[PDB]
């Protein structure tokens, strides 16, 4: 740790990413600034920013750990025992982490598919919901009750609970709007948490596999000599495409983006449907979407119809008003996202031959440049695709959220 910069960078990046995610979680529930809870546009924007930052920093930590393993590892002069023991049973670590992902994926997504099928077949009494088959998150509810009752018993100096999310407190209203109130937990919150766990585990599997097999594997014993960033090792052994650690980070970026997107959708719908709203003069709370998260968020059709279709009517009707920039950015981001697919799906030889024909046509008129045109390298073509993919997806979500929450 004193003779290497990449190990320190990896450690610091991992710690900073975890800290940023914690900061994002801890600011929506305990608002530290005045007139922040009742201003909904800022609350939604501050939660989404730091989540993306934390995810990116974590992926960077994985990449730089792989770089250290490829470059600075030295068993002769810098021998460490624990790293050697971890490297001597890497087959057991990956195979067990591979099993957990399959189990979690099945038991978290097949429940949604079963609910969807039972709904389609006219059998609503066989779904996993609060009315037919209940899967209650009992541990979280016990935690909520304990934290609600902690003041006055285990915290004598406390006059009130730390946050109002734990059930047992009182509603807070500022200027006719709802600031914070207890958040219920039900069967709909049981499934989405396991979705989060499944996605996190898959991302960890990809990144850890890359880091562990950066130096060598059963397929290519001398993978260390080839480098940290190399495309392949030829079509031999049936095909060795994307065996480097750089390609493992490239694959893990997609899964990080997939995992973070579900978190922000969960936050947005749960807060719009269960907390945010308005209070009349007599004390009746009317939420923005009227509490439809409990029943509609248990099937895939509910997210397509009640969330994506219903909440996107604000952005697509912004033309002619002061919010039309969001409507313009909504359509532009789709173009970038679809444009990314040209680099991800295609190869390098076709474009080199096309450029050959183009260069012939240029040579025909004495406008041939002295710097010979070349198509992008194999590694560069991958890097260009993922950048545009992430940019398009994030920009689309950004415009959608900002146009929706400012209007309502």
């Amino acid at each position: 740790l004193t003779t290497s910069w990449h190990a320190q960078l990896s450690l610091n990046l991992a710690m900073l990413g975890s800290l940023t995610i914690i900061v994002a979680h801890h600011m929506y529930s305990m608002p530290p600034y005045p007139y922040l809870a009742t201003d909904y546009a800022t609350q939604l924007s501050l939660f989404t920013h730091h989540m993306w930052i934390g995810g990116f920093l974590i992926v960077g930590a994985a990449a730089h750990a792989a770089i250290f393993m490829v470059r600075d590892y030295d068993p002769t002069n810098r021998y460490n025992d624990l790293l050697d023991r971890v490297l001597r049973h890497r087959d057991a670590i990956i195979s067990h982490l591979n099993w957990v992902c399959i189990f979690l994926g099945f038991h978290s997504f097949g429940l949604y598919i079963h609910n969807d099928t039972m709904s389609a077949l006219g059998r609503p009494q066989d779904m996993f919901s609060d009315t037919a088959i209940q899967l209650q998150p009992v541990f979280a509810q016990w935690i909520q009750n304990t934290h609600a009752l902690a003041p006055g018993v285990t915290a004598p100096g406390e006059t009130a609970s730390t946050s109002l999310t734990w059930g047992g407190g009182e509603l807070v209203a500022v200027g006719g709007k709802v600031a914070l109130l207890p958040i219920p937990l039900g069967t709909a919150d049981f499934l989405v948490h396991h979705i989060h766990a499944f996605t996190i585990h898959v991302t960890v599997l990809i990144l850890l596999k890359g880091v562990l097999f950066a130096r060598s594997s059963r397929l290519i014993p001398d993978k260390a000599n080839l480098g940290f960033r190399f495309p392949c090792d030829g079509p031999g052994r049936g095909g060795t495409c994307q065996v480097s650690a750089w390609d493992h980070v490239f694959l893990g970026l997609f899964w990080m983006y997939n995992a973070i997107s579900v978190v922000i959708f969960h936050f947005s719908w749960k807060m719009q449907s269960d907390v945010w709203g308005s209070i009349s003069d007599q004390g009746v709370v009317t939420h923005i979407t009227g509490g439809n998260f409990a029943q509609s968020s248990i099937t895939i059709n509910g997210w397509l119809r009640d969330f994506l279709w219903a909440q996107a009517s604000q952005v697509i009707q912004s033309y002619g008003s002061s919010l039309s920039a969001y409507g313009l950015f909504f359509l532009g981001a789709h173009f970038v996202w679809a444009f990314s697919l040209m680099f991800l799906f295609s190869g390098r030889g076709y474009w080199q031959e096309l450029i050959e024909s183009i260069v012939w046509a240029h040579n025909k008129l004495k406008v041939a440049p002295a710097t010979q045109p070349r198509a992008l390298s194999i590694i560069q073509g991958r890097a260009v695709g993922v950048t545009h993919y992430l940019l398009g997806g994030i920009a689309t979500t950004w415009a959608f959220f900002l146009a929706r929450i400012i209007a309502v």
């Binding site: 003779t3 910069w5 470059r71 710097t371 010979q372 045109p373 070349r374 992008l376 390298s377 560069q380």
Partner: peptide, 29 residues
């Protein structure tokens, strides 16, 4: 000579470990 040099120029701009093998210079940079 070819156009890949332009792309390679910006790809290794901040890779100090490839430029030099001396830890002192990397630390200063």
């Amino acid at each position: 000579d070819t156009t890949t040099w332009i792309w390679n120029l910006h790809a290794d701009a901040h890779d100090f470990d490839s430029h030099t093998s001396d830890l002192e210079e990397i630390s200063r940079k």
